[PDB]
Amino acid sequence: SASEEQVAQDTEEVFRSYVFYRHQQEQEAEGVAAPADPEMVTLPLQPSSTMGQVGRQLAIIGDDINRRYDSEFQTMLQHLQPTAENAYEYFTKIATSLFESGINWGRVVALLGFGYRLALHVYQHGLTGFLGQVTRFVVDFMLHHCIARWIAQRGGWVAALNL
Amino acid sequence: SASEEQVAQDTEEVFRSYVFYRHQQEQEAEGVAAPADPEMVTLPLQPSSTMGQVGRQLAIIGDDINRRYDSEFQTMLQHLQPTAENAYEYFTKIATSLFESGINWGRVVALLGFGYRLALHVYQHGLTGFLGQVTRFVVDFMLHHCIARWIAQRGGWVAALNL
Ligand SMILES: [Zn+2]
């Protein structure tokens, strides 16, 4: 019975954990061809917590289902400028488009995936210290766009461990 | 009878307008010794709107009452690093401290003033495209820390035109 508030708070850990494990997965799948981002290795993590577990499962299942959203995110970000303002504008546009026709778990994973790709792009183009900002983009968007409320209604982030 | 939501939305314009007029004021008071930030000149503005008027009044009255908060902000920011993460951490710490003992209009102006100084510091140390991010720091903090709710309870941002 996680409240909307609690779900909204949980998203920070879910996203950090998703980023960490997705990046570990990419390193496993790509080896030396994996895009480097040490920020994604050293971020705060609590692996055995529930939300740590959830982000990790979302990273594993996204490897399969998020493939097509990803391949585009990767093409369509190539053109983004590394300022905070461009980042935010681009984030808001894509995230709004993702949810225009409603919310489902696959689109939740897609948003996390987009956050991941956005954060990695801006880092590669020299904007350091911005991973926390993308996490904030995600947490806040999920809260104000009633994604947190939706999740809470499905049983909380813990409901994702079943996917 | 502006709702909490509406007040929260209004803060964007109030802050942009405050920044614009405060920066114009600084240029008037300091001339060539005024710190340069063209971002503060070219930001979106609607001068005859209510919130445009409110930000402008807050800029004028802050010139007198915010002097001592400011002089410190100016010293205490000198040490801040121009990453988004440092910015956010420093913003959150100071803004939380400002409101620890409650909310009043002078502390509202102080927060806008801090936003102003933070935005100008990071710009001067080379972080461009970050003014919108500081505006977002302000808007969101006011909403989640029940400042918007407080203002709404006082009659909305329009209640400030009397100060
Ligand atoms: Zn928010």
**Contact criterion met (CB below 8 Å) for A66 and A108:** no
Rounded to the nearest angstrom, the minimum Cα separation between B122 and chain A is 12
CA torsion, ordered B87, B88, B90, B96, to nearest 10 deg: 150
Burial readout A84-116 (b: 16 or more C-beta within 10 A, e: otherwise): bbbbbebbeebbeebbeeebebebbbbbbbbbb
What is the whole-number distance in angstroms between the Cα of residue A8 and the centre of ligand 1?
A: 10
Q: A22: helix, coil or strand? A: helix
Q: Which of A86, A133, A140 minimises the CB distance to B84?
A: A133
Handedness of CA B101, B117, A82, B89 (dihedral sign): negative
Q: Which helix (H) or strand (E) holds A74?
A: helix A67-77
Rounded to the nearest angstrom, the minimum Cα separation between B162 and chain A is 32
The residue of chain B nearest to residue A89, with distances taken between CA atoms, is B132
* B86 inside 8 A of chain A by CB: yes
State the best of A16, A136, A145 to mutate against chain B, taking most chain B CBs within 10 Å.
A136
C-alpha span between A140 and A148 (Å, rounded): 9
Of B20, B12, B64, nearest to B43 by C-alpha is B20
Place of tokens 């546009």: A93
| Burial zone of A162 (CB within 10 Å; 0-12 exposed, 13-18 middle, 19+ buried) | exposed
Burial readout A56-70 (b: 16 or more C-beta within 10 A, e: otherwise): bbbbeebbeebeebb
C-alpha span between A153 and A126 (Å, rounded): 39
Q: Which runs of consecutive H residues, i.e. helices, occur in A100-146?
A: 105-124, 131-144
Those residues with Cβ within 8 angstroms of residue A17's Cβ, 6 or more apart along the chain or in another chain: A45, A46, A47, A51, A52, A53, A54, A55, A56, A59
* PDB experimental method: X-ray
**Contact criterion met (CB below 8 Å) for A87 and B129:** no
The data reach a resolution, in angstroms, of 1.5
**Contact criterion met (CB below 8 Å) for B117 and B74:** yes
Contact between B136 and A85 using a beta-carbon 8 Å cutoff: no
* A59 inside 8 A of chain B by CB: no
Place of tokens 């070219």: B42
C-alpha span between B46 and B38 (Å, rounded): 18
Contact between B136 and A88 using a beta-carbon 8 Å cutoff: yes
Tell me the binding residues of A for Zn(2+).
140, 144
State the best of B12, B39, B136, B141 to mutate against chain A, taking most chain A CBs within 10 Å.
B136
Q: After which residues is chain A discontinuous, taking C to N > 2.5 Å?
A: none
* A72 inside 8 A of chain B by CB: no
| Residue B44 half-sphere exposure toward CB, CA atoms < 13 A | 7
Query: What domains appear along chain A, each with residue ranges and CATH number?
Result: 1-163 (1.10.437.10)
Handedness of CA B71, B74, B78, B84 (dihedral sign): positive
